[PDB]
Design a protein around this nucleic acid. Sequence first.
DNA 1: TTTTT
Lengths: 213, 213
Amino acid sequence: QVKLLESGPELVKPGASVKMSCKASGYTFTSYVMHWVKQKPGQGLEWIGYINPYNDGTKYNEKFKGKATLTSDKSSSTAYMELSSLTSEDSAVYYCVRGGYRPYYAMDYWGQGTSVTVSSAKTTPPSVYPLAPSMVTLGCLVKGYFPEPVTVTWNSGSLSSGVHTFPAVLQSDLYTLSSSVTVPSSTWPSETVTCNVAHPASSTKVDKKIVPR
Amino acid sequence: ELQMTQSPASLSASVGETVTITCRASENIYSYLAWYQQKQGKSPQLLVYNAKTLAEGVPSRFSGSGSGTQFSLKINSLQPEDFGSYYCQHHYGTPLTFGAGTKLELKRADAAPTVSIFPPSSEQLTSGGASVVCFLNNFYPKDINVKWKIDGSERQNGVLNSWTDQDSKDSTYSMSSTLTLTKDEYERHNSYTCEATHKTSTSPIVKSFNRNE
DNA sequence: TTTTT
């Protein structure tokens, strides 16, 4: 099957450069161009350009010429995009997208995307606080961490419906996120409810059981 | 450069209903117009190309048309899986440009939020901080106003608000509002109130708690 | 240079 494997989230300082990769498989790498599209948080799509792996030829969106550099490696079927002189405007998710049968055809296979965060803020592990009060709503406050993302689950996935995990909000260089879970009141606290929080950037995991005040 | 214009920016519809969204090219592009569907948190998927040609796998209830500068995408008898965002993009040479998108959400009857308030956790208080959390869960429409009052006076500083995307099971929205204070300021007041004003009532919904209690 | 790959 056609697969596009992109590199993981990146945190980089303003003014530095970042390079991400897109390893293809499932087709003749050199038979299709590879486009790159930018998508800022909760915003539209913007075409950056493409490269033709077959001949290393490149077409750029003028706004990106001199900013983005598209390369390609036939031996490893991998396409790269480098961005220089990063600013906050560059924080966004970047996708490599396989072109159609012909370069001018509509793009058809989008990768999962590489999230890029441009900031001088330092990696900070989260503090995790319990939110304790015929349904009862409980919760978990994940505060002061950087960068994104953190994952939050309840009872390691056994509690899935009745859960609302809210998008993190940045404040003074640190993110804060909350998650609520609603369970039958009779079941709590006789049946334990625990939030499991993971923050891969600081290699931190925290399990917090919610107990009655 | 060439500019695309999509309308409407947002639309609400019911399952089984038929709707039409539009895209306008600043310059003639003939029939070289593609439409992409992007689900919340997913990568875009190609739906149509050449303005009227459905990509492989795309259901026939989808129907694109137009040519030149005015295009429309019609969806007959909408299904649950159709809600999300839609972007048009011309594929008439480079640079490629996208419309700003149309967010297609599910319509449901109005519903008041289920509001829960939580005082700072003893844990957090030991670190010098005091966050007060309020969940306004499963309400509709998305538009809502939250206010924090301390001993009667509204507090505007240190409030962090975050909204979830529409729930795919019940078509509602949820919101989390966190009022962050320092522990010693928290200890100087007794009454804390989360106040929500929603379309569903003239009387704001209120949840309160007293520190000394 | 415009789509059954």
